[PDB]
Design an enzyme around this catalytic site. Structure first.
Site, PDB file in Angstrom:
ATOM      1  N   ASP C  86      21.885 -32.583  10.545  1.00  0.00           N
ATOM      2  CA  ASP C  86      23.281 -32.225  10.381  1.00  0.00           C
ATOM      3  C   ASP C  86      24.027 -32.821  11.583  1.00  0.00           C
ATOM      4  OD1 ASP C  86      25.567 -31.149   9.337  1.00  0.00           O
ATOM      5  OD2 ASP C  86      24.871 -29.071   9.358  1.00  0.00           O
ATOM      6  N   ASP C  87      25.340 -32.979  11.470  1.00  0.00           N
ATOM      7  CA  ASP C  87      26.101 -33.560  12.566  1.00  0.00           C
ATOM      8  C   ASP C  87      26.224 -32.652  13.785  1.00  0.00           C
ATOM      9  OD1 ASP C  87      27.765 -31.881  11.076  1.00  0.00           O
ATOM     10  OD2 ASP C  87      29.571 -32.983  11.637  1.00  0.00           O
ATOM     11  N   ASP C  90      27.825 -25.203  15.347  1.00  0.00           N
ATOM     12  CA  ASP C  90      28.870 -24.474  16.053  1.00  0.00           C
ATOM     13  C   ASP C  90      28.479 -23.028  16.334  1.00  0.00           C
ATOM     14  OD1 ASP C  90      31.349 -23.306  16.938  1.00  0.00           O
ATOM     15  OD2 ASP C  90      32.412 -24.921  15.913  1.00  0.00           O
TER      16      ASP C  90
HETATM   17  O1  LIG Z   1      27.682 -23.915  12.876  1.00  0.00           O
HETATM   18  P1  LIG Z   1      28.584 -23.514  11.768  1.00  0.00           P
HETATM   19  O2  LIG Z   1      29.721 -22.675  12.225  1.00  0.00           O
HETATM   20  O3  LIG Z   1      27.854 -22.924  10.622  1.00  0.00           O
HETATM   21  O4  LIG Z   1      29.248 -24.866  11.209  1.00  0.00           O
HETATM   22  C1  LIG Z   1      28.628 -26.170  11.354  1.00  0.00           C
HETATM   23  C2  LIG Z   1      28.556 -26.926  10.029  1.00  0.00           C
HETATM   24  C3  LIG Z   1      29.840 -26.973   9.275  1.00  0.00           C
HETATM   25  C4  LIG Z   1      30.514 -28.284   9.382  1.00  0.00           C
HETATM   26  O5  LIG Z   1      30.532 -28.721   7.945  1.00  0.00           O
HETATM   27  P2  LIG Z   1      31.476 -28.043   6.899  1.00  0.00           P
HETATM   28  O6  LIG Z   1      32.596 -27.425   7.676  1.00  0.00           O
HETATM   29  O7  LIG Z   1      30.649 -26.994   6.223  1.00  0.00           O
HETATM   30  O8  LIG Z   1      31.885 -29.211   6.015  1.00  0.00           O
HETATM   31  P3  LIG Z   1      31.253 -30.547   5.661  1.00  0.00           P
HETATM   32  O9  LIG Z   1      30.503 -30.488   4.369  1.00  0.00           O
HETATM   33  O10 LIG Z   1      32.280 -31.627   5.545  1.00  0.00           O
HETATM   34  O11 LIG Z   1      30.317 -30.967   6.683  1.00  0.00           O
HETATM   35  C5  LIG Z   1      29.551 -29.156  10.199  1.00  0.00           C
HETATM   36  O12 LIG Z   1      29.492 -30.499   9.732  1.00  0.00           O
HETATM   37  C6  LIG Z   1      28.184 -28.416  10.099  1.00  0.00           C
HETATM   38  O13 LIG Z   1      27.406 -28.742   8.959  1.00  0.00           O
HETATM   39  N1  LIG Z   2      34.594 -31.630  12.853  1.00  0.00           N
HETATM   40  C1  LIG Z   2      34.113 -30.435  13.177  1.00  0.00           C
HETATM   41  N2  LIG Z   2      33.710 -29.625  12.202  1.00  0.00           N
HETATM   42  C2  LIG Z   2      33.299 -28.439  12.684  1.00  0.00           C
HETATM   43  N3  LIG Z   2      32.911 -27.367  11.914  1.00  0.00           N
HETATM   44  C3  LIG Z   2      32.630 -26.367  12.803  1.00  0.00           C
HETATM   45  N4  LIG Z   2      32.806 -26.718  14.045  1.00  0.00           N
HETATM   46  C4  LIG Z   2      33.244 -28.029  13.993  1.00  0.00           C
HETATM   47  C5  LIG Z   2      33.676 -28.887  15.040  1.00  0.00           C
HETATM   48  O1  LIG Z   2      33.731 -28.665  16.250  1.00  0.00           O
HETATM   49  N5  LIG Z   2      34.089 -30.102  14.522  1.00  0.00           N
HETATM   50 MG   LIG Z   3      28.530 -29.354   7.186  1.00  0.00          MG
END
Ligand SMILES: O=P(O)(O)OC[C@H]1C[C@H](OP(=O)(O)OP(=O)(O)O)[C@H](O)[C@@H]1O
Ligand SMILES: Nc1nc2[nH]cnc2c(=O)[nH]1
Ligand SMILES: [Mg+2]
Ligand SMILES: O=P(O)(O)OC[C@H]1C[C@H](OP(=O)(O)OP(=O)(O)O)[C@H](O)[C@@H]1O
Ligand SMILES: Nc1nc2[nH]cnc2c(=O)[nH]1
Ligand SMILES: [Mg+2]
Lengths: 150, 145, 150, 145
Positions: C86-87, C90
């Site tokens: 995952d990227d 948080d």
């Molecule tokens: O640690 P957390 O508070 O659970 O959030 C972290 C997640 C959510 C956010 O993606 P999303 O906001 O879910 O959307 P996207 O599918 O575009 O990645 C990010 O890329 C991680 O996958």
């Molecule tokens: N782009 C982005 N998405 C998030 N989703 C939850 N935290 C983050 C953050 O710091 N950056």
């Molecule tokens: Mg995500």
């Protein structure tokens, strides 16, 4: 319609121009036309290894159908053995003025539209008159909303 | 001859293709062709707001036989099938067969494989090699001197 | 407060992560967490030479102080021999959910905030809790007005 | 140590943060860019501040310094900019030439940090700063073959 130019692409075009300006021994220095020719001039200086970089500052304000231009700062000389560089040439208004100040200089640019194309000694990319060139220094990496809000 | 593609430019092309896929409500999901379509698929998913992103992995084995390592379920109805480019359309033929009802699109397209795609953004000559961003990097380059 | 991440930098971090994942023969494939882990997963797949890339799509929904999770699609198995990426992490809400779906998977991310840091097997960059990470796919190179109108 | 990589995008970001500190713009008569490091940063400040008067100061080594070309004046009302300040060797020389000038840089190392009026990013003494103009996007083979 706009022609977006990123830093990477500009640098690629600059290196392609630098390869033509070889050898670097035939050049005393580089005259950059501020402010657009500053970045391309800096890139040529790096590639050619020229440490003598000077500038020529010329501001131009359009008043309906006539231009009012003034040289705020001018590099001493006639451009003999120098490379006069500017980012681009549109109508050729600036190019004509520069050629009159440094007639013995090798005038080059990165981009060149049809109008100013015959005024430059050499350039890299051809661009249409109707096409606006968006330079890197006028842009930035900022947040852009999704096409759709889905 | 070579054609360099930076991340910035790839994204510019992706956004143009995304606009042609509007409205996003007509799409159920996106199937990315590994590995070339992964990045372009991710960009479309962001722009169109599609969270259902799946993949189709194909490998190569006299003849050159195709091999499906992993496959996405369905015939592609309401789905977008995305790959980075189409050169000759060899893999494009295999994908068309698996997902006949899908809307196959790519960023780049050469003359030979141009007829196999429903839509693309940039035309590239047959003899030109497209250097993608994932294969490059920012490293020191010696001065021309 | 925010932290800007350009495409170039993300790739640099992704390559650093790929180095620790060597050898690549020990991996059966990569499971990317859509949509954030899609680009990072693609980079790893290229660097490690992995052609088997799958996804896990989970949708969130913040209803005041509680989250509503819905799995749209998921890869088969328990992640044995797979790399789930995952990227960023948080709060670690997603990380916990994913770790429970793929207990035998090697969970990694590029960025990691203090809260979710203990939930990953490996990451590359440390990010403060108060800092918002601005990813490349959410940005773009557009015209930016000068800091002054001189 | 290792190498601190600086891309064009990042350099521009730092340049804009510095530009905001040099406000108002009316207090400046012009900008003197130190060749060749301060050329790009000087061009960015000139754009952000709207200053069309940009001159240069070229210095070569041989160590004792040698002025290939120098901008006119004591630098009163001018901004002298260089990309960085390591030990302050060339910085001391600039101070002597343009005393009443506001000397600024993008990066600054511990040893040269005092010799400058303002900077943006702190870099360790042993860390080598790789500038964008010395790099380029080229093919980089995958970590695994
Ligand atoms: O640690 P957390 O508070 O659970 O959030 C972290 C997640 C959510 C956010 O993606 P999303 O906001 O879910 O959307 P996207 O599918 O575009 O990645 C990010 O890329 C991680 O996958
Ligand atoms: N782009 C982005 N998405 C998030 N989703 C939850 N935290 C983050 C953050 O710091 N950056
Ligand atoms: Mg995500
Ligand atoms: O071909 P012409 O019609 O004469 O215009 C081309 C000029 C003008 C423009 O700079 P300016 O718009 O003058 O501004 P800046 O100083 O920022 O480069 C561009 O960078 C070239 O130098
Ligand atoms: N940036 C930019 N400035 C210009 N000034 C005149 N023509 C142009 C152009 O195409 N682009
Ligand atoms: Mg100009």
């Amino acid at each position: 319609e706009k022609y977006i130019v990123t830093w990477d692409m500009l640098q690629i075009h600059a290196r392609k121009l630098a390869s033509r300006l070889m050898p670097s021994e035939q050049w005393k220095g580089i005259i950059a036309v501020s402010r657009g020719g500053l970045v391309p001039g800096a890139l040529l200086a790096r590639e050619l290894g020229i440490r003598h970089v000077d500038t020529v500052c010329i501001s131009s304000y359009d008043h309906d159908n006539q231009r009012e231009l003034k040289v705020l700062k001018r590099a001493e000389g006639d451009g003999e053995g120098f490379i006069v560089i500017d980012d681009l040439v549109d109508t050729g208004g600036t190019a004509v003025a520069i050629r009159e100040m440094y007639p013995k200089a090798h005038f080059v640019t990165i981009f060149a539209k049809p109008a100013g194309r015959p005024l430059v000694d050499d350039y890299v990319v051809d661009i249409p008159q109707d096409t606006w060139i968006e330079q890197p220094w006028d842009m930035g990496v900022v947040f852009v909303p999704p096409i759709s809000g889905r």
